[PDB]
XYZ file of C-alpha atoms in Angstrom:
312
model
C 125.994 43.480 47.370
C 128.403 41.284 48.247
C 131.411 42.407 50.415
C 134.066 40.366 47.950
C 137.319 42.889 47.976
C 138.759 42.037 44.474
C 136.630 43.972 42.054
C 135.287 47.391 42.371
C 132.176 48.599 40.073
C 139.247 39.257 27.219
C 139.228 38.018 30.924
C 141.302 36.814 34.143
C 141.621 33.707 36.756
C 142.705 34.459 40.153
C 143.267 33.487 43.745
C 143.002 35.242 47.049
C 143.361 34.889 51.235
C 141.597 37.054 53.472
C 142.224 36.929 57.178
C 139.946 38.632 59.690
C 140.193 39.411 63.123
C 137.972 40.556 65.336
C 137.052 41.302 68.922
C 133.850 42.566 70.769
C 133.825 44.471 74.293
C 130.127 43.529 74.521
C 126.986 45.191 76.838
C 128.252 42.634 79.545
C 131.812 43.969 79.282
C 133.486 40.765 78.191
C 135.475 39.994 75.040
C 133.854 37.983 72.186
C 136.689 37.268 69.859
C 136.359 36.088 66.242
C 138.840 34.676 63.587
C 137.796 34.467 60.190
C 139.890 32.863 56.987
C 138.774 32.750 53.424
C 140.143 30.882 50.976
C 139.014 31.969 47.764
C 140.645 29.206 45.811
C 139.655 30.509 42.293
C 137.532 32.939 40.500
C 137.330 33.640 36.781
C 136.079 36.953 35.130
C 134.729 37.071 31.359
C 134.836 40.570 29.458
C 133.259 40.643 26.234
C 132.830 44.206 25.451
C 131.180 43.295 21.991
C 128.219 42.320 23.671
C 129.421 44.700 26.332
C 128.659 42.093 28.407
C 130.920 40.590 31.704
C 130.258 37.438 34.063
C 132.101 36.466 37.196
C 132.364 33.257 39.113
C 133.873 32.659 42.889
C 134.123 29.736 45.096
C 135.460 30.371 48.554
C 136.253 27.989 51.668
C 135.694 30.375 54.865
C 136.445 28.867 58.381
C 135.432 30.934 61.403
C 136.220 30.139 64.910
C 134.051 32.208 67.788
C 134.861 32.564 71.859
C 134.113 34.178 74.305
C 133.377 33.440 78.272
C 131.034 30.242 78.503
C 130.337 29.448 74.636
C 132.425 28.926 71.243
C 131.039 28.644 67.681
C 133.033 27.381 64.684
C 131.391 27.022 61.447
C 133.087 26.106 58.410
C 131.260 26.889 54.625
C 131.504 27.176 51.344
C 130.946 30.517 49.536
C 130.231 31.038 45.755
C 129.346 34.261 43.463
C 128.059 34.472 40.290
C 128.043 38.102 38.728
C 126.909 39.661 35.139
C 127.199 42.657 34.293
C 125.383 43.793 31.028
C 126.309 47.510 30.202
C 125.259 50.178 27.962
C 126.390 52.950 26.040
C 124.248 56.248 25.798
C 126.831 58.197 24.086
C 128.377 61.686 25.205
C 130.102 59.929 28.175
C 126.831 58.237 29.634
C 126.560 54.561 30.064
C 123.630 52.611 31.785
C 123.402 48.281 32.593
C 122.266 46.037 35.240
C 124.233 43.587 37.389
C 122.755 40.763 38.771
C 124.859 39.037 41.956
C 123.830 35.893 43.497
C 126.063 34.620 46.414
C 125.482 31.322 47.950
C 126.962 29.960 50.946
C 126.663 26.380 52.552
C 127.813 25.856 56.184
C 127.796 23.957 58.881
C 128.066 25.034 62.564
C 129.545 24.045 65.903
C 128.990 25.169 69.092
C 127.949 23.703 73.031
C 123.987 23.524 71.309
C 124.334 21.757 68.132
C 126.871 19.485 66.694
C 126.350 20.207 62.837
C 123.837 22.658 62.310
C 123.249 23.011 58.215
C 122.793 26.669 57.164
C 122.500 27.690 53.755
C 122.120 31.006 52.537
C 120.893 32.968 49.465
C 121.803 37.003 48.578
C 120.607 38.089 45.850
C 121.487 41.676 44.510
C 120.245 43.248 41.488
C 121.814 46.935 40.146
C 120.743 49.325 37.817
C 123.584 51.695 37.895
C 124.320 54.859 35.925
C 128.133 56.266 34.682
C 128.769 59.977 33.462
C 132.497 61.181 32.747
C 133.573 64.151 31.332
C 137.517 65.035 29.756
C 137.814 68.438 30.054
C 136.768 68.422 33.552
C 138.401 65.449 34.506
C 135.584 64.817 36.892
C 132.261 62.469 36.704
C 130.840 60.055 38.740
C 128.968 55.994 39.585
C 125.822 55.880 40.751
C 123.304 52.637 41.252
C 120.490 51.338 42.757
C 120.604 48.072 44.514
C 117.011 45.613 45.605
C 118.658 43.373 47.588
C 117.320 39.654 49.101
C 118.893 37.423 51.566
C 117.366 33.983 52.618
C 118.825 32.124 54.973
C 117.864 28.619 56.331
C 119.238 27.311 59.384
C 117.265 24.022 60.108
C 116.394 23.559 64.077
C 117.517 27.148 64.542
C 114.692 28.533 62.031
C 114.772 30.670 59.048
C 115.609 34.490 58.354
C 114.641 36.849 54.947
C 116.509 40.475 55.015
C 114.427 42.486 51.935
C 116.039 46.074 50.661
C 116.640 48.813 48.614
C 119.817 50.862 48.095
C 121.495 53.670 46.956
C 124.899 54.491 46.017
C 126.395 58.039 44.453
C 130.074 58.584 43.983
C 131.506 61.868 41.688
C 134.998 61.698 41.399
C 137.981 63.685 39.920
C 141.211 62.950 38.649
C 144.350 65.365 38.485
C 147.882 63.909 37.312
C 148.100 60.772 38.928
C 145.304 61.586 41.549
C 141.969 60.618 41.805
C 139.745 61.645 44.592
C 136.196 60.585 45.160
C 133.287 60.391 47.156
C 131.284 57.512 48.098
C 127.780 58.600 49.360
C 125.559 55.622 50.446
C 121.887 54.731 51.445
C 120.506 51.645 52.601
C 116.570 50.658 54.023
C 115.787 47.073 54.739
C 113.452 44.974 56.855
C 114.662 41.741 58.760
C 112.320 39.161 59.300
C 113.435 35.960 61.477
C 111.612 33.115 62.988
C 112.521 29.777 64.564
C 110.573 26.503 63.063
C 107.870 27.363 65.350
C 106.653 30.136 63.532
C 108.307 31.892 67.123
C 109.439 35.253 66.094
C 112.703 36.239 66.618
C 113.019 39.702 65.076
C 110.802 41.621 63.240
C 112.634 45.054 62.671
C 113.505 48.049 60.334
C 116.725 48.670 59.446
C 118.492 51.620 57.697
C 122.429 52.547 57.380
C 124.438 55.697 55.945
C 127.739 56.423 55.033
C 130.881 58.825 53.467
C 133.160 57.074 52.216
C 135.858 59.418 50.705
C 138.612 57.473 48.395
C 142.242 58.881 47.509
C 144.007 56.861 44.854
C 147.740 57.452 43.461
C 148.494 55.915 40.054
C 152.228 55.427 39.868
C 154.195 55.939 36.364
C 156.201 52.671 36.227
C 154.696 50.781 39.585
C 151.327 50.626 40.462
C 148.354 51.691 42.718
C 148.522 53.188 46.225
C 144.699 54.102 47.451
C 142.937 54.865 50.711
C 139.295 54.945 51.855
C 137.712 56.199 54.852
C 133.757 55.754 56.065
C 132.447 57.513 58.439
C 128.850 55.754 59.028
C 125.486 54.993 60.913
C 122.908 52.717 60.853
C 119.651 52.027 63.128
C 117.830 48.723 63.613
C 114.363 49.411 65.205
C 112.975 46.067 66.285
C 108.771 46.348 66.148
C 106.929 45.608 69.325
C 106.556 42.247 67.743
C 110.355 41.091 68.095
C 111.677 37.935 70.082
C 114.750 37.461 73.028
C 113.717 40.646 74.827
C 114.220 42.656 71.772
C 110.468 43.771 71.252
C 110.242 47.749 70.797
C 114.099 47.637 71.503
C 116.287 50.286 69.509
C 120.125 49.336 68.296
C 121.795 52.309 67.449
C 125.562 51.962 65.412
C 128.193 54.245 64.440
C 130.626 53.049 61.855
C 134.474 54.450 61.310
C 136.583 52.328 59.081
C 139.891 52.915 57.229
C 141.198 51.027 54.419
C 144.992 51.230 52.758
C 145.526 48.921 49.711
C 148.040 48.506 46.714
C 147.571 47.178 43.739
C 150.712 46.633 41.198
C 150.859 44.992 38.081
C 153.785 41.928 37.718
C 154.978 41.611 34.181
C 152.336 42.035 31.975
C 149.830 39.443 32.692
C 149.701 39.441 36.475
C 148.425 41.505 39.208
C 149.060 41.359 42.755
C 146.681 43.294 45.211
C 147.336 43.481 49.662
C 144.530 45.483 51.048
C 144.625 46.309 55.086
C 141.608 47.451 56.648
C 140.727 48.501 60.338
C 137.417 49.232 61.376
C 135.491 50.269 64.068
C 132.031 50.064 64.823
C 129.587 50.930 68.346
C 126.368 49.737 69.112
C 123.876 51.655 72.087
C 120.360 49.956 73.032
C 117.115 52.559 73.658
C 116.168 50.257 76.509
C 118.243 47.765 78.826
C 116.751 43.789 79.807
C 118.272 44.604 82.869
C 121.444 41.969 82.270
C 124.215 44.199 80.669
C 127.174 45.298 82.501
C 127.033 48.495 80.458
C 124.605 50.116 77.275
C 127.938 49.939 74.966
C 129.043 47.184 72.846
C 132.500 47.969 70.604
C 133.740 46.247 67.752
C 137.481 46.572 66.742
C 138.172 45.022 63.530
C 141.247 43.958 61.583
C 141.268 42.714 57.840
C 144.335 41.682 55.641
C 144.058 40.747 51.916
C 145.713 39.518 49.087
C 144.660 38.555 45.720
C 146.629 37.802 42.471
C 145.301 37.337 38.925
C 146.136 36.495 35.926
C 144.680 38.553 32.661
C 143.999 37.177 29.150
């Protein structure tokens, strides 16, 4: 699915900035730092709940800039999503539908080794997903299934296909103004890369968990203060078949990310949203090349956001 912050699973146009930063104490104890903008210059959502029925369109301009000691990268792209959502009423508070995702991103990269490289990449996510809710209890919960494709081609640098399944179950409560939940997810995939050649890169198996609790505060008159946490790991187990050293090598990550947003309406058509999000993530290798300074990479992460729509 696609990481897009502005929607969470008659109609609205809207706008938003994201701003990312991010640096890397790497296996050779240096600092890769990374600055990411995205411009998401307009994106229109269509709710027809006769048909029960919603579609969503995105275009973003994202500019990245990459450095670290003896190489840059700067690529600069363009990023579009197209989303429906059909939905379905089972009756007794159940309700079933599928969302299809496709996002689609054209860039071009800089660096000391090419002057222009053309990548262009396909994700494609499909969702069965499955609602329950239930007033006396106040409690219920989401829960889908994701198959999930990624192509990307990358001209003289080769091509790479990511294939996978997920899950995703989250009960939740509400009380007064409250509402707690409970993200629990699930995710196995394969990655399959390859320059021109027909050279492997990586051939490996990949699989990622995560809690993700979610506290959310709905005020009277204002709007919505909310907080999530993960706590997470995931494994990528390159075959004996893998490229760059990597063959039979084992890439072990734990995940810890916090997120505080709030969301408030302005007048009664628009709504502004500023989302801050620090996370935290480190990577171990089963077995050293024999180059690293260490067998610990850490990633410290900073995001900001802010979005405002405009209902109709």
């Amino acid at each position: 699915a696609s990481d897009q912050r502005g929607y969470k699973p008659g109609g609205h146009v809207g706008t938003s900035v994201e701003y990312e930063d991010k640096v890397t104490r790497g296996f050779n104890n240096t600092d890769k730092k990374e600055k990411t903008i995205t411009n998401e210059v307009f994106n229109f959502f269509y709710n027809n709940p006769q048909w029960n029925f919603m579609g969503f369109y995105s275009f973003k301009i994202e500019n990245r800039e990459q450095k670290e000691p003896g190489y840059y990268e700067n690529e600069d792209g363009i990023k579009q999503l197209f989303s429906l959502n059909k939905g379905h009423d089972l009756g007794n508070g159940w309700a079933t539908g599928l969302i299809y995702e496709l996002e689609y991103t054209r860039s071009k990269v800089y660096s000391p080794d090419v002057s222009g490289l053309r990548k262009n990449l396909a994700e494609h996510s499909i969702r069965p997903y499955l609602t329950y809710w239930n007033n006396d209890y106040n409690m219920g919960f989401y829960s889908n299934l994701e198959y999930l494709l990624s192509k990307e081609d990358r001209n003289a640098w080769g091509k790479r296909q990511e294939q996978g399944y997920s899950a995703l179950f989250k009960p939740y409560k509400r009380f007064g103004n409250w509402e707690v939940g409970v993200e629990f997810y699930y995710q196995i995939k394969t990655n399959d890369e390859k320059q021109p050649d027909g050279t492997i890169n990586e051939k490996s198996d990949f699989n990622e968990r995560y809690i993700e609790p979610i506290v959310q505060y709905s005020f009277d008159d204002a709007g919505t203060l909310y907080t999530r946490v993960r706590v997470g790991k995931n494994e990528t187990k390159n075959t004996d078949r893998s490229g760059g050293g990597n063959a039979g090598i084992n890439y072990f990550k734990d995940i810890r990310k916090a997120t505080v947003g709030y969301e408030q309406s302005i007048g009664e058509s628009w709504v502004a949203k500023a989302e801050y999000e620090y996370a935290n993530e480190v990577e171990k290798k089963s077995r050293l090349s024999g180059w690293e300074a260490r067998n610990k990479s850490e990633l410290t992460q900073h995001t900001f956001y802010a979005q405002a729509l405009y209902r109709f």
